[PDB]
Every structure is written in C-alpha cells, then in structure tokens.
Amino acid sequence: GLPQADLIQEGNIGLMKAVRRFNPEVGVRLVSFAVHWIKAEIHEYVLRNWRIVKVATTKAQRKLFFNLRKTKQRLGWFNQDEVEMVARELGVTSKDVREMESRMAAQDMTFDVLYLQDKSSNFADGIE
Amino acid sequence: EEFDAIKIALASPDMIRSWSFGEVKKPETINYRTFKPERDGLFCARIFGPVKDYECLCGKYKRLKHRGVICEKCGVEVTQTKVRRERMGHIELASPTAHIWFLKSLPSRIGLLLDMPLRDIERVLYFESYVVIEGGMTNLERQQILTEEQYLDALEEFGDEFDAKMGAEAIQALLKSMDLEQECEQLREELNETNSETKRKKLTKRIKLLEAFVQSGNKPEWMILTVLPVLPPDLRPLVPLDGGRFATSDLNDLYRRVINRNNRLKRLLDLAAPDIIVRNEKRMLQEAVDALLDNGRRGRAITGSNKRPLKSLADMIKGKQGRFRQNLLGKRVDYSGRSVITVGPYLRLHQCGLPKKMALELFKPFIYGKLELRGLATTIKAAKKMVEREEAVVWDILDEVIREHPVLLNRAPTLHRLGIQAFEPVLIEGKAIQLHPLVCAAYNADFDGDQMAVHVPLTLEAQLEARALMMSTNNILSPANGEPIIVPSQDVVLGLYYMTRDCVNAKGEGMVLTGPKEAERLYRSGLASLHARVKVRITEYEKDANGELVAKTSLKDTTVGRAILWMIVPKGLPYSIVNQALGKKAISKMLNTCYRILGLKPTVIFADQIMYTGFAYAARSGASVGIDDMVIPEKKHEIISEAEAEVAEIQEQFQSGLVTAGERYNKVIDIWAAANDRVSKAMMDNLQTETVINRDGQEEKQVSFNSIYMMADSGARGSAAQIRQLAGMRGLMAKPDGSIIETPITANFREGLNVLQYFISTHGARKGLADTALKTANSGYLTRRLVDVAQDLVVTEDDCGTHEGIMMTPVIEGGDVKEPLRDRVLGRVTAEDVLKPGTADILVPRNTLLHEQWCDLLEENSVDAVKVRSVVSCDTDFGVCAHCYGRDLARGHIINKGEAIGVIAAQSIGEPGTQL
Amino acid sequence: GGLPRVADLFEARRPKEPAILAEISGIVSFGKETKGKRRLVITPVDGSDPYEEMIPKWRQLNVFEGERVERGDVISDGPEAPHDILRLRGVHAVTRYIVNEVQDVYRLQGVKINDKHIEVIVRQMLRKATIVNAGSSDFLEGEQVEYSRVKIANRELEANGKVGATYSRDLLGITKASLATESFISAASFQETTRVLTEAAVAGKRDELRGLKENVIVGRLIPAGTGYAYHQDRMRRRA
Amino acid sequence: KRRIQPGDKMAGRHGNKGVISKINPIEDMPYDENGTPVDIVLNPLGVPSRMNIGQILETHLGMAAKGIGDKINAMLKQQQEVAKLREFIQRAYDLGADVRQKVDLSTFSDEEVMRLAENLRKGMPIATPVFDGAKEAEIKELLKLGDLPTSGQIRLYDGRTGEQFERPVTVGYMYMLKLNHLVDDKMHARSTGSYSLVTQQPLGGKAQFGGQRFGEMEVWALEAYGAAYTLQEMLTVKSDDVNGRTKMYKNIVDGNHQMEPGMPESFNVLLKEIRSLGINIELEDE
Amino acid sequence: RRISALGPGGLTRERAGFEVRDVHPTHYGRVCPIETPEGPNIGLINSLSVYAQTNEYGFLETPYRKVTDGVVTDEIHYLSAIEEGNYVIAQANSNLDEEGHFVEDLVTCRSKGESSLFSRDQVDYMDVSTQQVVSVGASLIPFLEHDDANRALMGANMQRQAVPTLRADKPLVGTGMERAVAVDSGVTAVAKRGGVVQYVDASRIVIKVNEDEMYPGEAGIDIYNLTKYTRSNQNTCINQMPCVSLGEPVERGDVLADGPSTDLGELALGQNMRVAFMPWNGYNFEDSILVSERVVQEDRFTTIHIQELACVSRDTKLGPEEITADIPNVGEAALSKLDESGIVYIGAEVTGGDILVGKVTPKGETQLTPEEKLLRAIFGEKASDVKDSSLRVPNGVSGTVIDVQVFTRDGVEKDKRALEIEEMQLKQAKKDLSEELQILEAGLFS
Ligand SMILES: [Mg+2]
Ligand SMILES: [Zn+2]
Ligand SMILES: [Zn+2]
C-alpha cells in the first residue's frame, strides 16, 4: 500500500551503493550483484512506513514480519499448537509470535467514542 | 490580552524560524513498546515540551521546585504539559517549493505578478520545461519558455552566457529579480497610452496588485517556501487504543511524507547523484508539500486506508465542518438539558414545568453552596454524598434555589427570536417538561414527540436580561408585523364558540335577570341552558378622554352564555365585544382591543382567563365526531349522472369528427369542474341549517349544531375544502408531469375509494411530501445569506438632518385595492408637512410619529399620498437613526438606540420562507 | 414564483431578456446596419453624442424613427433588470420595485411582513460606489470604494471650499455585497475562506472589531443591546 | 421492567400519534349509565383536518365486536346449555351481505364448541380486508345483534361532578400501540463533565454525558433580543474558557455570581492552524 | 423485503431529482406506493408488493388472470412491465357471475399506461386480488380506503416501531393477514411433523411423531427447545411460550409456541383500549392523550428491556490483571453480592454504583505530599501495589441479574463458575440424549 514512486527512489539509492562497491575482475554481471542491495533498501522502507508506528524493531520481530504473511493461511488467531511450530523454525519465542500476530491485524482509525475525550479535563473533581 | 485589531500578512523565513522552538529532523512519532516520544521526531518532548506536568522525560526531576531546570540527560524542560498546544516547530527544505494557495487560487497571484500564463508556470514548476532567467546573445530574452530540445539547441550554440533552470528555484529567482517601481511606471505610461478597454482592465488589475505589494511591505519572493512550520502536537493527537490500535490525524502522515522526501533529497544531493533522479525527488517533494498545504486542488487527492482522501490543513478551517461554523459561531455548552414536552393546562403564562431530577442535575453547585452556608456540610464531598442520597433537606434547599431563577427554553429549529423564551420553573414529578398551551404557536411545537432544550443563566446580568427581555409575558406582539402572537386556538375557540351560540327554543328563554351572577347561578343549577335568549342588566365602563371610567347600566338582549362570559372581561371594554358568536377572529380582535385600550398586564390576565374558560366549557360541551356527522347530499347521484351523460355526448360528438380531441378534453374538464362545484354547493346547503320548533309550535330555521360544521365555522380547525373531501367529492387529480386526468374521483372518504382512485391520489401526496422535505434547505440557505449580509446594521443615532423620503400610496392591481394607506404608514415618521392648504387635509407637522389616532384622522378625510422617512435615505454614517426607522413593532413605541435591526429584518423575512 | 423568485430578486440576477431603456433624453433615430445590429443613434436636445445601441434583430423594437424620448423610457418592453432602474431612475425607484416585487410573492400566500425590513436589506445592498471623476480628493478613477467613505471625504473637503469627487452607485447581490465587506474575518467565516484569506494576506489588511460576528468569534460583548454602552465607553476612552 | 408514564409515545394504525400527558384517577374518568369508565380520551378535533375516518369506523366495529363478546360471556356465566351457545354463535357467524366465508358449527363436537366459546368471551375477532372491507350497514347490523345503539354514540357523565355531558360522545374500542420512544431514554441533563481533546468543548450525546448545542440560529436569536451578557456567558464560561469556567464554578460554590471571561481556545487553535498554513496572523495591541 | 436505490453502483441522496422519487404507472402491483420513509430518503427506499416476484433477468412481474371469450379461466400468468402495456387488464372490483362472465357491458380497465372504460370483448387479463397494490405493512390497516395517503404512510411507518408488551393481545378488528405474517416471520415454533404432544413445559416441547410419517430406523420423536428471555438487537426481550396442552394432537404446519407479539399464531402488536372522543379540560390539546390509572394498574403496556455489560482482563506492561473478590479500599458491604470468584450472584438486584465483576490492576510508583503521607501513617493503613478496576453498574441503571457468561483462553484453566455453567449445559445435553436412549432401549426390550 505504499506509493510506487517512493519505492522506486529507495531502490535507486541501493543501486548506487552496489555500483560504488563493484569489482569487475570477478566476472559476474552487475545485475546479479545489485539485486541484494536494491531489495535491502526497499525492505527497510516498508518496515518504517507500513503503519504510523514502527511495527518491527528487534531482530526477532523483523524475521516474523516477512514470514507470518506466508505462514498464515486461515483468518483468525493461531491456536496454542501452531505457535510452537512457527516459533521452532524461526528460532523465536512463543511471546514474539503472539505479539507480532496482534500487530499484523491492527487497523488504525482516523481522528474525527471515548477517545476524543481529554482524561485530565474534569476540573470539578479536582476542586472537590 | 486587550488587543484592538487583528492583522494578517505574508510570513518571511526569518519570522517562521522565530516562531519555532526547534527543528524536526526525523519521521518518527512514538515507540511501539513504551508510548514515549521519539527524539527529534514529530512528537519530540525536547522541542514541543514535557508530556507530564512538571516532569522530564527520563524522570530525574519530578517536582514543582524544579520550575525552570532543563534536564542534563533528556534536555526536557520541567513545565506544564499544556505548552504542547502552543509550541511550533519548523522544517528546513532542501529545495524551494511554491505555495499552492498563491498559485492555484484564481486569480493566480504569481502569474499576475510575473505576467506569465498559469500553464507555463505549472509546466516550469513540475519539471517539464525551462525558463530563461537572464539574457544571452539576444536570441533568447527573459521569461522565455525553452523546451528540452530548444534548450539543447540553445546551449551548444550560445554557450554558458544564458541561464535557464527548472522548478521553483527559477521562479524564485524571477520573483527576486523584479523591481516594482519601474514596472509600475511603465504600466502607468502605457495605460495612459493604450486605447483598448480590456488592456486597461488587465493593467489596472496588475497595477492594483503591484501597489498592494509596494504598500503592504511583503516581498514577492516570500510566496516560495524555504522553511516549513509545524503544527503543535496536541492539535494533531495520536492516542493508543486497547487492541493494539491507534487513532491519529492525517496531518501526521502528511508531515511524515514531507520529512521522508526531504531527507531522501538531502541524501541524494550528498551522494553526487545524476540530475534526473534529483529532479524526480524535487518534483515529489513539491507534490508532497502541495498535498500537505491543500490536498484536493491540483490533481488526484492523496488517499488513505479507506480510499478516502486525507484531510489537509485547508480543510480544517473551511466548510460547514470547519473551525468557524462548527466551533466559533456555535458551541456545545454546560448547564443544559433536554426532554420530551407535554401540555400543562393549569400553568400561568410565565411558568413552565420542570422535572425534579433535571433541576437537581442542573443546579448542583448552587445546592452545594447553600448546603455549605447552612452548616449541614463542611466539605464539597459531604454535600455531594448528601445530594446523591437525596435527603429531605435537599428538596427544600432546591425549592429555595429555583425561586425567582428563570430558565431558557429552546426548540430547534430556531427561525425567529421567539424560539427562545424565559420561564419561571415549577417542579413536577415525572421526566417530561410541561409547556403552556399559548406559546406553542410561537414555538411551532405540537405534543406528538417533540423535544426542547433547557438552559440556566448563571450571572446576575444574565438573569436580569432574561427577566427584562426574554420573559414570555414581555413577548406578545410579533416583531415582523406587530400583530399579537398569542392567539387562542383549537379547544379554547370551540369552547367559547359553543358558549356564545344561541337557540330559538332553549330552556329558560324569556327570563329577565339582575346580572351575570344570576345567569351563572341559573346555569349551574340546571334551570336554564347556555343558549337561552334572555334580558340581563349589564354595567359597562368607558374612558372619557380624562383617565377615569364612567359606568353606564342598561338592559341588554343577550344569552346566558354571553352573560357568564362577560364576568371575565376587564373594565373598559364595550359589551358589544361578547354579544355575538365568537370565532377565532373575534377572540383575536378581543385581545387586540384589550391591549390597545388597557395595556399589557390586563391583556395577559385576560388571555389566561380566556384559556381557562374555553377549556372548561369545551370540556363541559362534550363535542364528539361520528360517522353520521358527515352528511352526503341526496342529489349527488343525479348530478354525477348528468355529468356522465354530458361527457358521453361530447365523446359521441368527437367520434363523428365534429370536434377535435383537445377541445373535447377541455370541455370534459370544464363539465367535471361545474359538476364538482354543484356537488359542493349542495353539500354545504344541506349541512348549513336545521329545522326546529319554536314556542308557537311552528317550524323555524337556524344555524346547525353539527359537530363538523361547528368545528369548521368556529375556525378551531378545518375548512370547507376538507369537508368537500369528507362528504362531497375529492375532485380532479393531476399527473406527476402536471397534467389533469380526464376522469375525477367521484367518491369521498366516507364512501371509500377503489384501487384505481387511491393509486391516482398517491401521486400528489408523494409530490407534496417531497417538496416539503426539500424546500427547507433552500429556506435555510436564503436565511443564512440574509443574516450574513445584514448582520452589522445597528441604530446608532437619535436623529439625522435629512429632509428627503419616499412617497407612500395604496397599491391596486386589477381594480382591487390590495393594501390601504393606513397599514403602510402606521408607525412611520412624516418627512414633510401634511396640512396642505387646498386639500383640506389634517394638520400634521413634520417629524411626527404616525400613531393610530393620526392614522384614523388621515383615514376620515381624503388623503392618498404621504412622505415618510426611510432607512435607505438616511444620512447617518455606519448605522441608521431612530426617526428614519420608526416604531419598534414588538414594543409599540419608537425604537431605542443600539438595536440590531438587520438581524431582526433577516429573521422576519426568512421565517415564512417554508410556506412558499 | 415562490422562494426561487425571492432568491433571484435578492441576488439581483439579470433577466435573460432585458428591456432597452432611454439612456438620455433626445430624439431617436436609426443609423448604420450590420449582420445583426440595428443602430439607435439619438440626437440630444442640447447634447451632441449620438449614443448607439446593440439590438438583436429578432427582438421587435417599440420606437419609431425621429421622435423624442425622456430618460428612463422603455424600449422593447419586457422584464427589466434592477441595475438599469438604479442607474437611470435613481434609488427610490429600484427600492419601490424590489419592495413591490417581494411583497407580491409574500401577499399571494397571505403572509404579512412590514416593508422596513426589505428596505433595510436594500440599503445593505446599496453600499458601494465607483469614483467617476475625482477632483481635490485623493481617489483613483474607476475604482470601487465604500459610499460612506466618499461621503466623509466630500464633507471634509467642503472645508476650504474645494470640489469633491464624482461617483456612481452600484447594486450588488447579497452574497457579493457580504463578500465585499471591510472586515476579512466576517467574509472568511461566511464563504470562500481560501480566496478571502489569500487576498487579505497579499493586501496586508487589518481588521478592527466592529461587527457582531467578529465580537462573537473573539468572545467579546456585541456592540448592540446591553453592550452598546460598553462599546461607546471604550470608543470614548480611545478618543 | 418499564411502565408507562407521561412523556411516552402512543399511536394507532391510522397515522394518529400522541404523547401521554396525564395519568387520571379512575373516579375522575367519564363513565356511562352502568358505571364502567373509559380507558383513553382523545381529542375529536384531530380527525377532520387530517381526514382519517378509518379510526372512527374501527372504533364502531370494535364496539360491536366487544358487545358480541360480552353477550357470549354473559351466556357463559349463567351455565347455559350448549345448544343455545351453538345457535347464538351460528347467528353471529352467519351475519353479512353475501360473504364468502361459511362456518358450519354442525360439524363441531360439544368440547370444540365450548373451547371456541371460551376463546370468544373477550370479543369476536373480525377481519376486514383492504379495499374489500365491511360496509356501514353491516356494522350497524352487527351493532343491532349486540343490543347496542346503531349510531355508536352514548351518554356519558363527568366523574368529578356526576353531571351529564350535553351531547352524545362516540365511545368504542381501538387498537393502540406503544412505540420505541420512551422518555426514560430521552431525558438528559448535565452540569459539568469532561471536554474534547482539541477544541476543549463539551462532547455530544446522552451516552457521553454531553451538553446541548447552542448553534448559530440561537446566537442570531440572542443578538435579536440584545442580551449581550447571556451570549457572552454562553460563549466563554460555559464552553471553552479553561480558566473562566473553573473560576465560575468556584465563585458559584461561594455564592458570588460574578464572571471573568477570557479568550476561547478554539480561536487560538484557528490562529495556530492559519500560522501553520504559512500566513502571519496576530493580535495587534492598540 | 426492502428495496433500496442507494449503495455501490446506485444513486446519491444529495444528487437525486424529483423524477426518480415519484410514483410511476409501472409501479402498479410491483412497488408499494405508500410505504416509504418520510425523510430525505423519501423516494429512494421502497417496499416489495405482496404478490410481486422477480423475473429470470431480475425484472419485477405480477400475476394476472386470463380471460378468454369473456370467461375468466382461473389460470395465472406473470407479466413484466413491458408485456402488460399491450393488454387490456380489468380491475379486481369487476363483479362476475358464478360461471365467470362480466355483469356489466362496460368494464373499467387499464391500457397503455392509462385507465378508461372498455367493452367486455376487449379484455385480456384481470387482477387476482384487491391486495395486489399494497405492501405487507400497508395490508394490515383496516379501513385503509377511508384514509388519506399521507396518514396511511405515517401509520405504515409507525406500525413497525411497536414494542412487545408483557402479554400479547389479539386485535379485535383486523385484515386477515396476521396469520401469514406471524407464521412466515419465524418467531414461532411450528411443528415439522404431525403427532401427539408427549411432553410440554415452559421451555420444552416433545412431540411423538405418527408412524405414517416416521423413518424406518428412528425413534420418531421431535424436540423443540424454546428461547427464553434473550436480548434482541434493540435491547428488547425475546421469549417463547407454548400454546399446546399435554396429549393434544398436532399436524404439520401447526403452531406449538408463540413468539413475541404473537397470540395463538396471530400477529398482536398492541392492546385493545376503550376510547372516547371528546375534549377534557385541555389535556387533549394538540394530540395529547389522557390515560386512566386502571391501564397502569393492569400492566397492559409494560415492557421488558435487557442490557448487556462486559468486563475484560488484559495484560499490561506492569503486570497482568486479575479477577478476584479481594478489592482494596472497599468494605465488606460492597463485597456482599460477590461470590468466591468475584462475580455477582445470579438473581441479585443491583443499582447504580454496584460492583458486578471485581478486578485489580498493577499501579506502580506514585507521588504523595508529606502531609497526606503522615496522615496515612497515623491512621495506620498500609500502602498497596494494586488499584481497583472493577466493572460497575452505570449510573441511572437498575435491574436484576439473569445471566452470566465467562470466556477463558485455551491455555488458561477455567474457574469454578464457568465449570458450573458447563455442567449445566452438559446436563441439558445429557437429558436430551437420555430421552432417545430410553425410548430405543424400551423398544429393544419390547
Ligand atoms: Mg411534532
Ligand atoms: Zn530528565
Ligand atoms: Zn435618518
């Protein structure tokens, strides 16, 4: 859901990094060498801009961000048994799997319901 | 805090930098794990302020004693958390960007200043073509649009001498290079030279703009942004929710996009990138800035998750949901309530029924104060507990609090000022508000589910204003035309009409009575009926132009009911007022005469007594409605038969080619209209009268006592047009396109319609319902426009030295005198003399307020033309004078200074807009 | 009609078939001919200007050749725009026209409203004026300025016995008249906030607190009713 | 459980709706010759201008049906034999002018007839289809069968005084409905509560303990009246003057009805937004 | 049965003209002309007619009777709006004979979008009923033909806002459509197969199916479980009550239990009231209604309303939340209605402020002024690390507790009260299965 123009420019910076670090004597084409740099810049941009707040910061969270999309097959929450199976392969704890599962399905509402109320505004209680 | 005016001007980069408390450098908002602000982000506490009262971010200082310390670790000042609503930031732009308001808002200011087409400026700004900034070898001149191929041709031949750029930097250089005074001189010269008028108009617009820039002091290059201010964080909230969700404003997303693209542009510029990628990044930065300032103005609006466009800064302050109309011209208020309204038939005109629970909730601080004063409670908490438990002393305290404390009642929509009135509360049980029946017409309220709002004035001045201006007893005349606004209707009118009717052979006819008290005594004991014709000794008083009342006793020919009703009439009115069958118009004339002769308080008392008597005798009458009260005339079948025979004759005449189809259709319509008129006349003739035997044993005729006829004739409710549908014929129905159907509905609601007739009739009902549902918005829009245009006119002077005016004459159209002179000159002030030797006219000196007596004097003689002063011809600057306006229609005397007549005029014009 | 007719009347919308009117007295005559143009060269009794006029050839003309007409006369009868009435027959004529036109619509439905309200609305509609020729005054020619400002300028120019400015009076619809006020806050709060704010910022305007809406917005006492004395006292202290 | 009270909304099936205004004692209600009072009293004025006569016809037919049911109940209370009940019920079911329905009680057992009579002692249900309904003459015939006046009007007496009303009154039975607009869910009041995050103004809605909206039209009305102090009170100390409302509360608790108004927060928000738009706007001192 | 013109791919309320909102001649028999909202959606939301169907392409069609040689043949064809415009269709009010001929020489008919008078030999079709034009709601109004269209629309709109009362009362004057509405709504229990009522209870009915309707290898008993005092979408009461007795024979399609606003299988939305038409001292002013106290004493318009409240225990940064009966800073008076699990007893009477579910939360560090700390130390009360976060009754709300539901995570172990609830459910299931087990074992032993 990110703009296409922003993704293209992120890859362009990664392409320049590979060009600056290219050894012609290896004999491989620059296309195969630069594919790792370009996709690394795009991945970092998606993590920081997919939501209003960064979803994955630690090492374990980043691994689960790109794997839970494919591992998840049926809508809803994982049962207890499915947590260990996911955690065993990726080398993460059961706490991380459940925490990232909640972060994936969260939908952010727009500001316009008990969230518009200022919780430190009741002056009558303070006077009493 | 005592400002005198508000000033607006352009903002320089230095001013924007002076506003800010720091620079936002990172596109981060908060940490997901701990809801703490990120450093140098859009919510940074170092820039905008602490998140908690008298605390720093890390937590070293946590007390008020450290009022001004800046923490060495976190760098956060230790102050109040409310400063986050006032502190702004700024963003340093890597490349200049144009302000979309000064570009796309027609007429374009940048284009007019540069004398360049808007399309060329748009092409240059969004990196599609070049523009010449300085001359080369004279092949290219300043402000010439070079295409990429033309730029390639020019660069190789002319060398580096000429300069051409792309984006906002070139336009900024062009704006900075200009000198305004020489341009003004040249424009003035060639304007004096030119002969074409369109060129003159264009150049006078350009000169206006240039002189505006010269006089204002703003610099032309300030329309290109180099520093971008940032809204304080508390005006764009970001609050966490339970299930890992957040609620956020779109401004955060727009700011993050702008910051991201600016940082990427800086990184590319520091990386020695090729020109095309930097050009693309600059274009995207310009697009992001344009979207932030005003989203939906140039192209596709940037959308969010719900496919809806993001709300920008400009959307916050414009529209029906913007700051102005939603929060500044109208607000939600404390000390208010709302409940369903019911009718109270016992209340006096100045009283309303308020539920006990509503009053208890509304008057809480007053009860707390009076509880503390009496010593029954020492703290606020103890009074709160006592009120919550609802002890008996709280009710007495509330009864003391509400005494002589008026409240305001309001019903939406408020079309005129009579929609808000003050009443003295009376505490009742239940949860419904009780309303006096006589103010329903002013409120346009009926007891079928309507709700009304309650407001409590707080200060002494507000209470005095309510009592002196907004009390119901002070508002009895309409401010639009001066007619009384409290008119009895429905049950009261029917009761009085039934009270004041007469019968030929009623029980007790022929007696002679000593007075109204004897008549009441006779009626209550069942000896005589209300409709008996008798003779009564009646005493009536009259003012004799000296201030005193002179009695005059005599014997009158009247009825028992009229004599009984005479006991409530105040002293000073003739007996002829009540010596007739009283309808709605008669009651209105009674009230108007009472107001004219005696005043205001007697009028209020008389109205209350009239309402009580009308209700009582309407209840005693026992009027009802039955299926037999709708008498169908016996000649209906015969008339319909003749109409059908004539229609068949016309049809046969058409079948032989003698008459065309359209003439046949018109003749059928005419025949059916005549038949309907005949049926209606027969119905009304049958329903109008009845037979009765008198004292001599011979038959007589008199007005009927039919319930439907009585209701229609008294004017309480109904009209002949509805009786025609009830017992005569429905008539001719129109097609949805507006054409008249050949066959009318020959049945009525008593007989019952068939399927086809009802289906035909549904069309007009739906059309009328749709028109009623749709005209209100147009009426409201017109009222808003009138109020806005007329809001600032106030009477400011007692008298102006003008002598002019306008000529007032009666208006006649088609030979019918539509409006007489008295109703057009009543309350005005004469511009010139009226004595007029030669016409034998009345001696009326100049500057005379035309009173009712002067109107009568002008009426008796033959006068057809008078000059009166008008507000259009007033000679007062910034307002009008009292004499040119005339009479305050709501009060009756001359208008006082400081009255907002524009709002009153707009409301008076707009209120009946829903009746068209 | 009904409500749309009143809205059209108060917005000063020109009818699609305006009636030609006599711009000045003088003998009428027919002049040159074009594809669809019939000239109306007029010889004044004392003037010289043969003022021509544009007339589509399908519209019948109700004046012969060679007779004299007075100012405000009707040519090619039909609906008449209030602008021509104001320009030729004056202010009272257009006031009477508007009042009668509105009162006919309100009378058709049996609704009674006093004329002074409509007169107030018309007076608000008659607040502008353009300087035709300025003498001793410092007023540009062809610009639109407030009429009361011109009155005050002429009154102060009567000192030393100089000559005032020459002006014509404008008629504006309620929307355009309200959008042309001297206070940008009220105009911005009414309609078209972006344009008003942009023009005010470009012009560098300042707004005194005079109207009711401005004081309501800033939360002060309105200069009417019980606040009139307070505002008068504040003005006295400022003076 | 919720019981009816003044303020509740009631309505029929003919577009006639209203709000309960008073609960009257039983002895104050109008009563007939036999002393049985009426349950509900409606204004006859509403019928003519709205032109809904179906309610009157339904009232007459309901009175006829209740008379039939009362006769059946009277027969049941006297322990009469089954044959007489059969005859009377067959007479009731045979009334009409060429109706399609045929009911033969000769194919009913005694227990079935007893059950049917038990189910009929509160009134005989009658079906009248739309556009194929019962005529007025049929209604009068059924009224005759029930020993009731054919005009549908009877004499009533005032419960408070015992005096007879001067004209006959239409009395009968009509089907009434209680609508989902209860005054229990509509009454709301607020003294002081919480406020919004940005505008610092009270919220809306009963569920949020919000306040009433004082819109632009009410401001226009107040300006027309000329009550400047009331307007200023509604604009600053009641809605969004943060210090003003606290000082007002403290003053009211101390019995000093005095006001010190300030500047609304929304104006500051507007100024901040306009400044964020890159435009320099400020308040000029003097 | 609602038809709307809004939604995706449809019109817009603000951008709709008068033409699309008006009644069209083709609406006859397809769309009810009087049932529509009275607000800004007046012409955009409609109701389906009683007999209207949809064609295979999605076009509305209505049934008609075919007349041949002046004889109505009692055969029915469904005609679309296009087909019906080319025929002469007689009204349903055209009186006939026993063998099916028109009485009058001239009969009123519709043709080419208009109505006129036609001879008996030109007729091609005839309406099937007088109910063909109105909707379901409009067909329940007696004497509708004597009512104006506007008030008929208002009554039709108001008829569906009625709240069911404590006891259902049949209407004395009806139209005959109540039974169909009540049966087709599905709020009542309808016997699937005939038989004899073997067991009847306030919440359970067992039917012994006749052997002619049984299957070879089944016990042939039908069990109906009734819903009792359940919440509706509008916070009203849904309750079923049986209308059959022990031993009564039943047939397929018969009604066994009555739903809300139903009386013996007939729709019953209100009550029969004795009404008098007269003014009474001003209490009838402007549509007001005066009601006797006997109506209140008999509870004829009393309604039951049910409200639901929830309490959630979550995980916090400081620590998890707990549901318990140990709440600090509250005396034993408040904790009297709580059980050992911290949940209010079923059947307790509660008012505003009462505690329903007890819960505590971690609180963390706090700041206190020295004077208050010294007062606390003097009074001797200790400092606690938890804060009360219990679920309380909102102010202005009272009532009786009639049901409690407890949900727990799979990993978390169930508490006592949820165990009791599941034992009750298991007992119900065990009885339901034991009926069949007993009857089958009795058959085997026989
Ligand atoms: Mg109403
Ligand atoms: Zn710190
Ligand atoms: Zn004057």
Author numbering:
A (entry chain E): 72 to 183, 198 to 213
B (entry chain F): 15 to 930
C (entry chain F): 1136 to 1374
D (entry chain C): 1057 to 1342
E (entry chain C): 528 to 973
Q: Can you provide the manuscript's text about this entry?
A:
During bacterial transcription initiation, σ factors associate with the RNAP core enzyme, guide the transcription machinery to promoter regions of genes, and engage double-strand promoter DNA. Primary σ factor (group 1) is responsible for transcription of housekeeping genes, while alternative σ factors (group 2, group 3, and group 4) control transcription of genes during adaptation to certain intracellular and environmental signals. The group 3 σ factor, σ32, plays a pivotal role in the heat shock response (HSR) required by E. coli to sustain protein homeostasis and cope with heat and other stresses. σ32 synthesis is modulated by the secondary structure of the 5′ region of σ32 mRNA, which serves as a “thermometer”, responding to temperature changes. When the temperature for growing E. coli cells suddenly increases, σ32 is rapidly synthesized (induction phase) and then directs RNA polymerase to promote transcription of a set of HSR genes to respond to environmental temperature changes.
To determine the structure of E. coli σ32-RPo, we reconstituted the complex with the E. coli RNAP core enzyme, σ32, and a nucleic acid scaffold. The nucleic acid scaffold (−39 to +15; +1 as transcription start site) is composed of a 28-bp upstream double-stranded DNA (dsDNA) with consensus sequences of the −35 element, a 13-bp transcription bubble (complementary sequences on both strands), and a 13-bp downstream dsDNA. We obtained a cryo-EM map at 3.0 Å for the E. coli σ32-RPo complex with local resolution at the active-center cleft of RNAP around 2.49 Å. Similar to other σ factors, the RNAP clamp in the structure of σ32-RPo remains in a closed conformation. The omega subunit is absent from the solved structure, probably due to low binding affinity. The σ2 domain attaches to the clamp helices of the β′ subunit of RNAP via a polar surface. The σ4 domain of σ32 uses a distinct hydrophobic surface to bind the βFTH of RNAP. In the structure, σ4 adopts a helix-turn-helix fold, inserts into the major groove of dsDNA around the −35 element, and potentially makes base-specific polar interactions with nucleotides. K130 of σ32 makes a H-bond with N7 atoms of G−15 on the template DNA strand, which together with G−14 were identified to be the “extend −10” element. Specifically, H107 blocks the path upstream dsDNA and serves as a wedge to disrupt base stacking between positions A−11 and C−12.
